Design a protein around this ligand. Structure first.
Ligand SMILES: CC(C)[C@@H](NC(=O)[C@H](CS)NC(=O)CCC[C@H](N)C(=O)O)C(=O)O
Ligand SMILES: [Fe+3]
Length: 329
């Protein structure tokens, strides 16, 4: 039938410290995972994921249709022309099961210069009413910075894994301008489950979301303990086992570009499972003007012929292409 992917659990705690040899040992494990299936679990990460899951559940379960329209992105509410990324992504009863809420850098305010200039991909977050959802915005903004901190540390591991100084990626990952997003996704239990929400893969597997590479530098994902993800290998798709204490980490296609595909962006898909669950990704994106010169770790000199790609142009094109290929979420 279907085999299981080798997804190692890596203790990332040395990446927060000052023991340089211990950091190299973490980096070696990141390298090995990135060259194998492309996924690993980050453990001993220091984030209170129990509070994350509880607060996210309380939001998803208490928000009403009125509030969802008021928060909806432009795809669901033509009045909200400025909300392409941030806001609520509605389910469609009988047709579309998944819903989610996406928010961006809390530092993007009307006062921010990228907002003043109307630069694409930058938006001001929208939030529910504090009286109906007490503490939610405070929790969500805090969480952004908590997962930002973990992601910064992981980026030091990836830099060391590739033979670079530890700030090689992290220097471009800044609180003032990061395009990183959090998505709070609800996959509901439904009976009957809408057939229109289930896709059939070429190999017959029933899916909630088709194969893709991620639009990110790396993706830092929390999920509740319901198995759903599969990664493509040359010998077919393999199941990724769930772990609701760890963060699942993989590279996105910007990492594949800048390493000349030495660290590939793994192709993965989401199997259909009729179970109430959470999927909480943090997409590690750089700043709009961030450019990293591509290199090829396989070459003594690291020379690559690939063109440098501005992160903002990469992200704008990548988000649109993912909608065109796999559907509006
Ligand atoms: C596999 C998970 C990461 C998750 N998939 C997803 O969230 C999928 C594929 S990675 N991602 C997207 O649609 C991109 C959302 C980008 C976000 N609106 C933004 O503006 O930054 C899932 O559970 O479906
Ligand atoms: Fe993905």
């Amino acid at each position: 039938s279907v085999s299981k992917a080798n997804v190692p659990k890596i203790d990332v705690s040395p990446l927060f410290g000052d023991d340089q040899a211990a950091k190299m040992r973490v980096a070696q494990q990141i390298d090995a995972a990135s060259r194998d299936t492309g996924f690993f679990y980050a453990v001993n990460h220091g984030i209170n994921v129990q509070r994350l899951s509880q607060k996210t559940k309380e939001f998803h379960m208490s928000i009403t249709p009125e509030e969802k329209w008021d928060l909806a992105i432009r795809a669901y509410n033509k009045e909200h022309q400025d909300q392409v990324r941030a806001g609520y992504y509605l389910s469609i009863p009988g047709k579309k099961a998944v819903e989610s809420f996406c928010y961006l850098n809390p530092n993007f305010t009307p006062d921010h210069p990228r907002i003043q200039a109307k630069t694409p991909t930058h938006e001001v977050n929208v939030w529910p009413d504090e009286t109906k959802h007490p503490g939610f915005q405070d929790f969500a903004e805090q969480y952004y910075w908590d997962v930002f901190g973990l992601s910064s540390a992981l980026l030091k591991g990836y830099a060391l894994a590739l033979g670079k100084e530890e700030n090689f990626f992290a220097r471009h990952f800044k609180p003032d301008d990061t395009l990183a997003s959090v998505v709070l996704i609800r996959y509901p239990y439904l009976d009957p489950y809408p057939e229109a929400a289930i896709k059939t893969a070429a190999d017959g597997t029933k899916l909630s979301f088709e194969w893709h590479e991620d639009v990110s530098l790396i993706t830092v994902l929390y999920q509740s303990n319901v198995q759903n993800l599969q990664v493509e290998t040359a010998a077919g798709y393999q199941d990724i086992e769930a772990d609701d204490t760890g963060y699942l980490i993989n590279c996105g296609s910007y990492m594949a570009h800048l390493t000349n595909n030495y660290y590939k962006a793994p192709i993965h898909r989401v199997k259909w499972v009729n179970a109430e669950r959470q999927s909480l990704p943090f997409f590690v994106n750089l700043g709009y003007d961030s450019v990293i010169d591509p290199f090829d770790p396989r070459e003594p000199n690291g020379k690559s012929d690939r063109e440098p790609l501005s992160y903002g142009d990469y992200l704008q094109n990548g988000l649109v292409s993912l909608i065109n290929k796999n559907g509006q979420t």
